[PDB]
Design a binder for this molecule. Structure first.
Ligand SMILES: *C(=O)CCCCCCCCC
Ligand SMILES: *C(=O)CCCCCCCCC
Lengths: 169, 575, 574, 169
């Protein structure tokens, strides 16, 4: 009925998540990751959802370098929407065991938890905590990122070219 | 990325040792984040995950430890489509018309004036994968009335990756680890090395998802255009999509359609060691080369190895021969922790003297009809010991030099599959002029930078935390470094700063063994856990890395609770 | 770029006064170089040139003084080509096939491995100009088996530019200067303001080489494609290359085929003032607008002026009205030297108080569902006097704010041709939430820069010489600065550094007048003469600019030889 | 041919050239410009000649921002060779007064003079003095730079586009 996770931190702030099941493990993991890297992650989910241009402009480049390189937002948005389609997400999620489905749903909930905390106040993440693109995500959003990680050896390297594949006029 | 897997014969201990050393991003969503997951009656795993990923991708449990490196094996391919006359959005397969699957996508885009307008494009998929624009590559590859191009990535249909890592997180032996890797065959674009408790042999494998093509197809399916890209993208299948016989094959023991069967994918177990530095599977072990596997995995006795590969394997041989200056002749946790941060530079160790002998006398040159005084440059390099440590002086000069050395006909002793670590070699005397050109330029650049020629590397190579420059060590693998600290910043722009978005560099580092007492692991997260500059965990790890002080990371409950900085908190909410 | 031309009515003296203020590059071959040329019996000119140009483009002599600013006038045009079926390298002109003029070019290119390999491309020309690939503009304008595209720049056949600057260098009167400009009509892409010794009026002109198309042509010759982007390239002729009637026309007093006659190109003479800040000729003088001239020169009362244009004119009017806080009501050399380095910000002066009154009560906000503390931001900006001086505190916050303020229906009082310096205005209360969104981001940026909200501008905006950071003043035109010091560097990457390759900024500056004793010029070259860091002339000029200490540049032989740093040496070769 | 120029420098290093004719004025002017800004200038003549790629690589961008922007060397090279052809230079020169042609001849000679001094030795221009692109120029090379300045309002803005304008495959 509930997610519950104990978060132990040691030297260098290394988090040790203890949970009773997989869903709660994802909850704790999602929390600590956001707690430490909210701005990067928030920006990242814009990418996979293909929602960069609406916030940051179409002609601007990816802020962060990645397996995707740093194409223009507009091309990146098209790529992700085209290749990481609702269908691709469906097929990905349909092949997963229940524990991983639960774990990702927990991950999202945990990530969303911190978003609430950052919005409410705190001196942490001053750089992005009050931006519109710092917002709740869904499990499918996480699955999109997971699918994206797979494409590093293929599609990712042809993002702009895939986004601009058009027939003769 | 580097990884070593040592067996009991190299450890002299009851278990092997695993060194993980991915060279990855220091910023962005793909950067690693270190954590431990304890899931009652399921898993107790520790290591690293991309930000956004819920399972450990590189780490260890009580029974196994593993790391990854990018593989040379191609994971994608191109299909040239024969279009239906009249419809550029339909293609032909064995004479049968097939319509491309369209998707009209609308993307909201903010304008410089703060307004949000809609940008709409219609994009297509074929049965092979998304259409792709290769015009920029070569305008003759433009999507026309006759022909178009699609790209297929084998991982587009691979949904077994997270499930692979999750089961590894749970694995209770290396044998299980291996069995899992063979069941799932879901690793997307990386090699694997692993060591297990109570197992004498270390494990290497490039077992994963790889396009399956036959030598026949490679000869009779590659299209005129395709044969032109055999140089730029070697081993990338560029086939005719108008013939079904040119589709990717499925083997009896294939887990995924179009992918190679498990039994035709390379692997190796060894009592001494296994290793990869981003070259092919060929030299997993130098003493036991792998051969005969599909060409899409890369060359195996035909191509020279990178300087970093040569440095990597050399380091291991000299360790086990006891000639590397470190105590004993075994790969002990303590010794490995040091050797991997040795900052040895292959290019210098092997070629510097030859270079200086060829150009440094006289030291007064005429370069491009201009007088060049290179006496100081020569003296500094001669006094340098070919290491990129913080106190090393002149290492940056060598960097600026080597990166400008023309590689064409530079070596007189060609590559030999018999001696892959010591060939190619022999600086060509005919390259004298080009070398002085490169050295002259190198001296100038260092001049622009404001750094002395003999400045200690720790002042040129650095990362900023708390308003102070922490000295760093290592370099770029192109110069034969093993310890990688590779800045994207030009030296003239304030030195080799690591504060921006550096190139693939040391990130998460683990040295994992399995003594009788239980898993023991020493780790680094070079850039630290948090991207928030105000965070207490933005520079704490970094400061230790600068000082070369590994962290003995707690794993057991007693170790965690006994940690000096132990704090616990419970987070709960309705599901 | 800015320039003023003050007449005797404004100076209250025998001669006028010229302020040249090009906002240009701080690095590269186009950057300015200050020098004086004395050629026995031919010329004695002093000023500035692009590195690589042997005559003075901006400066003064013993009789005249001038400067330039980029013009709104379009200097190019497009020609949609109707290809011949079968051979796409030929186009139809009134029916008859015409061949494209080809040229196979091999460019040696050094590969990443250090080898040099040849790359060969076959490119083409038409009778209009070179073929241009507009596919990147719109995939529909690809060079097809039916239609191609060519570009024509009127300056391509203009071989009179240097000769004009040369003649100006030698000119003996403002009247000759003007006669030269009309005679040569070779100025390529800039406006011109000139002042003269003993001449009562100042001179403005957008007299140069400009494409000539008739209203009839605009209607008939504009192609379907052409119509589809006359809002992306306003006033750029996008004509049909099939009809000869669609070729640029030549008037009776046209110096160059396809260019506008000298009679229908804008100019004005005033005893009060002339000025330009990169807007159209329309407001050369605000009291006497210019209208009627062709559209290709730009809007003349249908478009709002930039903030910088409004700031420039506003400063002149307040000077002559004697209400800018400076002595007297005349544009004297001493006062102009200060006024132009005033660091006034139009956005702040006009709209800041309105924005704070709207959004800073309260100052604890909820933005994007998030609690935001803006108390300090509101306090700093209220204390700030809307200037970008070195001691000014909070100017950088405004910069980061204003550049993120959505302009759509931000103003309640729209543009009025009858009041173009004070319109548009009126911060719409409906934009409060949007303003808060922008301000929250701005505070977040400054926070990540390591600079306090109240940091003095001199510490955020700077230039490094000899390891020491010289404090700077000024800002970017978009914010409504007149004194331009515009960094390309994001504030989060070590502040507004000017050590990289900044945006167009104060480069060569000259305040030139003609007292009885003779020409007197005060000048700045912001980045200094030498690009070599080891040179004594790398940061000597820059230090002075930082401290705001103008240089009285020697002109007369006696002044040159009498200079405290006089050095002479002669160079010869067969 | 027999150029002679007196160079007076005052505060801030401002030079005042004195010559008996236009040729000798150009000599003095070209010398002082190179004396103060050799590296930049030497680099610029690569551009206008279309010889950037040979030395600096084709994929690399222009080092300096200008009216030309900062396209890829390879495209810039094609642009300049195509638009600033020998014919373009020929006609520019054909329409010049004697004194200008003379002034440009001198300017080239003056520039080349300093080039020889820089190559000979010294610590000035340490950053480029030993590079191959630091080389003597011709009067025509200066005319290329002069012509290039005119195009800032037109062609320059479509450099890449002009260099990639090729007929249909
Ligand atoms: C070096 O190449 C490091 C290997 C890349 C990252 C490994 C993480 C697992 C993702 C497949
Ligand atoms: C400001 O807008 C630019 C004015 C100066 C540019 C170049 C001046 C000489 C004309 C070619």
């Amino acid at each position: 009925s509930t997610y519950s996770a104990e978060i132990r931190r040691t030297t260098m702030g290394v988090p040790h998540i203890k949970a009773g099941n997989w869903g709660s493990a994802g909850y704790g993991f999602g929390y600590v990751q956001a707690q430490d890297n909210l701005c990067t992650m928030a920006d990242s989910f814009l990418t996979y959802r293909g929602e960069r241009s609406r916030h940051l402009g179409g002609s601007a480049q990816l802020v962060y370098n990645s397996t995707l390189g740093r194409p223009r937002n507009i091309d990146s948005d098209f790529f992700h929407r085209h290749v990481i389609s609702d269908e691709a997400v469906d097929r990905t999620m349909a092949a997963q065991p229940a524990k991983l489905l639960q774990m990702v749903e927990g991950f999202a909930a945990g990530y969303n938890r911190y978003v609430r905390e950052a919005k409410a106040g705190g001196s942490a993440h001053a750089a992005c905590r009050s931006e519109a693109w710092v917002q709740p995500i869904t499990a499918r959003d996480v699955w999109r990122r997971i699918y994206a990680a797979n494409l590093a050896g293929g599609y990712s390297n042809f993002a702009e070219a895939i986004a601009n594949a058009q027939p003769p006029q | 990325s580097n990884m070593y897997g040592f067996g009991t014969a190299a450890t002299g201990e009851g278990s092997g040792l695993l060194f993980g050393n991915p060279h990855w991003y220091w910023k962005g969503p793909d950067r690693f984040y270190q954590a431990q997951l304890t899931i009652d009656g399921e898993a107790n795993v520790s290591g690293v995950s991309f930000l956004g990923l819920p399972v450990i991708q590189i780490g260890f449990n009580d029974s196994v430890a593993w790391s990854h490196t990018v593989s040379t094996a191609r994971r994608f391919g191109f299909f040239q489509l024969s279009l239906v006359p009249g419809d550029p959005t339909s293609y032909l397969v064995d004479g049968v018309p097939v319509k491309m699957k369209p998707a009209t996508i609308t993307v909201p885009s903010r304008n410089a004036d703060g307004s949000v307008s809609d940008v709409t494009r219609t994009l297509y998929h074929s049965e092979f994968g998304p259409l792709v624009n290769l015009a920029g590559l070569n305008p003759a590859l433009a999507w026309s009335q006759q022909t178009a191009f699609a790209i297929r990535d084998i991982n587009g249909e691979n949904f077994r990756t997270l499930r692979t890592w999750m089961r590894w997180n749970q694995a209770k032996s290396l044998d299980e680890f291996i069995a899992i890797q063979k069941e799932e065959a879901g690793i997307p674009w990386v090699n694997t090395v692993a060591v297990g408790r109570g197992d004498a042999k270390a494990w290497y494998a490039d077992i994963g998802v790889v396009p399956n093509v036959s030598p026949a197809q490679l000869a009779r399916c590659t299209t005129p255009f395709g044969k032109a890209f055999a140089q730029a993208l070697p081993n990338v299948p560029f086939f005719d999509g108008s013939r079904s016989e040119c589709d990717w094959l499925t083997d009896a023991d294939s887990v995924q359609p179009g992918a190679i069967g498990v039994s035709r994918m390379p692997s190796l177990q060894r009592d001494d060691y296994v290793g990869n530095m981003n070259d092919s599977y060929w030299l997993a072990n130098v003493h036991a080369p792998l051969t005969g596997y599909p060409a899409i995995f890369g060359p195996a006795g035909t191509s020279a190895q990178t300087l970093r590969t040569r440095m990597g394997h050399t380091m291991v041989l000299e360790r086990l021969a006891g000639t590397d200056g470190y105590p004993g002749n075994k790969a002990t946790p303590a010794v490995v922790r040091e050797m991997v941060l040795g900052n040895r530079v292959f290019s210098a160790e092997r070629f510097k003297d030859e270079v200086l002998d060829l150009i440094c006398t006289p030291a007064q040159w005429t370069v491009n009809g201009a007088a060049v005084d290179a006496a100081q440059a020569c003296a500094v390099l001669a006094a340098w010991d070919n290491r990129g440590r913080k106190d090393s002086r002149g290492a940056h000069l060598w960097d600026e030099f080597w990166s400008r050395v023309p590689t064409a006909s530079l070596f007189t002793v060609p590559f030999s599959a018999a001696d892959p670590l010591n060939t190619p070699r022999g600086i060509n005397a005919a390259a004298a002029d080009a070398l002085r050109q490169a050295m002259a330029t190198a001296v100038a650049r260092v001049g622009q930078s404001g750094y002395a020629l003999d400045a200690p590397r720790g002042e040129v190579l650095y990362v900023t935390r708390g308003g102070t420059r922490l000295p760093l060590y290592g370099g770029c693998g192109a110069m034969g470094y093993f310890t990688i600290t590779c800045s994207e910043n030009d030296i003239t722009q304030g030195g080799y700063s690591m504060d921006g978005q550096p190139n693939a560099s040391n990130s998460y580092m683990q040295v994992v063994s399995f003594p009788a007492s239980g898993v023991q692991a020493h780790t680094f997260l070079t850039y630290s856990l948090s991207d928030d500059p105000a965070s207490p965990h933005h520079g704490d790890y970094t400061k230790a890395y600068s000082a070369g002080q590994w962290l003995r990371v707690p794993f057991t409950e007693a170790e965690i609770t006994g940690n000096a900085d132990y704090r616990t908190a419970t987070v709960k909410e309705l599901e």
